Amino acid sequence: XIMPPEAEIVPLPKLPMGALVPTAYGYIISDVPGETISAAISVAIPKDKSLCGLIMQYEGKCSKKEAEKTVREMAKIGFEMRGWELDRIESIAVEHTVEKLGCAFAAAALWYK
Amino acid sequence: XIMPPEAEIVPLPKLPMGALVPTAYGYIISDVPGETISAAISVAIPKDKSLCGLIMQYEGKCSKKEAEKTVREMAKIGFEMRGWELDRIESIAVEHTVEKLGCAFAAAALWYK
Amino acid sequence: XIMPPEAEIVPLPKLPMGALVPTAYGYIISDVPGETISAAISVAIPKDKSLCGLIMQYEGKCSKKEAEKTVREMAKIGFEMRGWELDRIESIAVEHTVEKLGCAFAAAALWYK
Amino acid sequence: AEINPLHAYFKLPNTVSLVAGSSEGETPLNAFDGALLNAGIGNVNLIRIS
Amino acid sequence: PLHAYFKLPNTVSLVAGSSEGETPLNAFDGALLNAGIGNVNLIRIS
Amino acid sequence: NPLHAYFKLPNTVSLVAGSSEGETPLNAFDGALLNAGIGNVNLIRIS
Ligand SMILES: N=C(N)NCCCCN
Numbered sequence: 001x002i003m004p005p006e007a008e009i010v011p012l013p014k015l016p017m018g019a020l021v022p023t024a025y026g027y028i029i030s031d032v033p034g035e036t037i038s039a040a041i042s043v044a045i046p047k048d049k050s051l052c053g054l055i056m057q058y059e060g061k062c063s064k065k066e067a068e069k070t071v072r073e074m075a076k077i078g079f080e081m082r083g084w085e086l087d088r089i090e091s092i093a094v095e096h097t098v099e100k101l102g103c104a105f106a107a108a109a110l111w112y113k
Numbered sequence: 114x115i116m117p118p119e120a121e122i123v124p125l126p127k128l129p130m131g132a133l134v135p136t137a138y139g140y141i142i143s144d145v146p147g148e149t150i151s152a153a154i155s156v157a158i159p160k161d162k163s164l165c166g167l168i169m170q171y172e173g174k175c176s177k178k179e180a181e182k183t184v185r186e187m188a189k190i191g192f193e194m195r196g197w198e199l200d201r202i203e204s205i206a207v208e209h210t211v212e213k214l215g216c217a218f219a220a221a222a223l224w225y226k
Numbered sequence: 227x228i229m230p231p232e233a234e235i236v237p238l239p240k241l242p243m244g245a246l247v248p249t250a251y252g253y254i255i256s257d258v259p260g261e262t263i264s265a266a267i268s269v270a271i272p273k274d275k276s277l278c279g280l281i282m283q284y285e286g287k288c289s290k291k292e293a294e295k296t297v298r299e300m301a302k303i304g305f306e307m308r309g310w311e312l313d314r315i316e317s318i319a320v321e322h323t324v325e326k327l328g329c330a331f332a333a334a335a336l337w338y339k
Numbered sequence: 340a341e342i343n344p345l346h347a348y349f350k351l352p353n354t355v356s357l358v359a360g361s362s363e364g365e366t367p368l369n370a371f372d373g374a375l376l377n378a379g380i381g382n383v384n385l386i387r388i389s
Numbered sequence: 390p391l392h393a394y395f396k397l398p399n400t401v402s403l404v405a406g407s408s409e410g411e412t413p414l415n416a417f418d419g420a421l422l423n424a425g426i427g428n429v430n431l432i433r434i435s
Numbered sequence: 436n437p438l439h440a441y442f443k444l445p446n447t448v449s450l451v452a453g454s455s456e457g458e459t460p461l462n463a464f465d466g467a468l469l470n471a472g473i474g475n476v477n478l479i480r481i482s
């Protein structure tokens with residue numbers, strides 16, 4: 001996940017080493033050579049600025065494009081379930097083709113301005 | 114889980130959205146139509162108020178009744194393992210009959226008065 | 227995991243009951259009679275004190291010595307990946323031979339002086 | 340009136356509330372989210388304690 | 390201090406333990422008790 | 436100028452992502468975090 005009301009989405013700041021960072025994340029690990037794994041994260045922002053944003057995570061054996069589409073849909077469903085008006089959805093995803101043993105990771109890290 | 118000493122069991126208060134809530138929970142998700150799933154939480158309260166309470170969680174493919182009976186037993190066992198005198202055990206459980214994909218969730222949310 | 231820079235490895239302090247303690251841990255549970263299970267934790271300490279330490283965790287169906295060897299190696303690898311000079315690695319391990327159902331647990335609890 | 344329990348380690352929670360809920364969902368995570376909402380704790384960040 | 394200052398954890402303690410249990414959770418609980426951290430709330434770090 | 440800001444609720448969110456190979460699952464995970472730019476902090480998973 002939940003983005004606090006009035007919180008701003010910003011590029012990752014210079015975090016002090018060892019910080020206890022509240023993080024919503026999705027990840028997947030695979031040891032299957034040639035296998036393509038992906039992870040995605042989405043943040044649904046409400047029109048009503050008094051409300052919170054919803055953070056959804058996804059991971060699976062699919063393409064980057066498929067992962068982001070899925071996680072974005074998940075965020076939308078979250079707002080539909082609450083019945084809140086959506087402003088927009090922000091997201092990113094990553095895919096990895098396993099060589100020997102690989103990991104795909106996506107997250108929303110909460111911190112302080 | 115652990116209920117801090119002297120903590121009070123109260124109805125869930127209004128929580129600020131996005132709040133970071135320390136929570137002990139049990140949950141189960143099933144995608145088998147017609148299957149019954151449950152989750153339960155118990156809190157064993159000590160007679161010695163300087164001691165802490167023990168929070169147990171349970172989840173499985175059984176009734177709400179069995180789920181609660183089991184989690185209460187787990188709390189009882191926890192106190193026996195510590196050798197502490199039990200005052201009582203507070204618990205709650207929930208059961209869900211899956212239609213297509215469902216989730217049963219039970220929790221003990223720690224907060225501030 | 228991550229041991230903050232300037233943090234110090236000390237014996238477990240007297241923690242207030244119910245305290246919310248950030249902890250890196252590994253654990254394994256088994257119901258296979260006679261099976262030996264173990265868990266270990268390692269902390270790679272940097273020579274450059276402005277850097278952080280890396281905490282690794284491991285658990286498996288093996289002896290205590292095997293678990294500790296593995297987790298110490300994981301920490302070494304973690305420093306090689308970062309290209310950091312290694313001062314030393316502190317580690318701990320535990321093993322358990324299952325009677326009916328048992329658990330092996332190893333952790334690095336982070337706290338404050 | 341806000342508090343980050345992970346930073347204010349010297350301020351322990353002094354209340355406990357038992358909640359439970361269930362829900363269907365189009366994905367496991369959405370079902371989970373629905374269950375939390377049904378439990379009345381769906382708009383907060385749960386820091387799982389073990 | 391009259392003014393609380395934010396700080397990162399500055400101590401790390403290694404502990405370990407094992408235990409039998411009637412259920413997985415009770416065994417895990419017994420293991421923490423054996424390790425000396427059975428009565429605090431562990432916030433698992435990733 | 437707010438004081439004791441770190442004791443209050445986080446007020447920023449940052450999306451990151453990365454991937455990596457590893458000799459073990461945990462090392463691969465670590466490499467992924469490092470690749471995402473968040474490898475030297477303690478992640479407290481929120482759900
Ligand atoms: N003793 C603990 N902190 N944890 C194990 C028992 C509680 C499981 N909810």
Ligand SMILES: N=C(N)NCCCCN
Nearest residue numbers: 001055056372381383482
């Ligand atoms: N409502 C919550 N706090 N959690 C469930 C939905 C968030 C999934 N990252």
Ligand SMILES: N=C(N)NCCCCN
Nearest residue numbers: 227281282435465474476
């Ligand atoms: N870099 C991190 N924060 N985590 C990855 C490794 C975690 C080992 N317990």
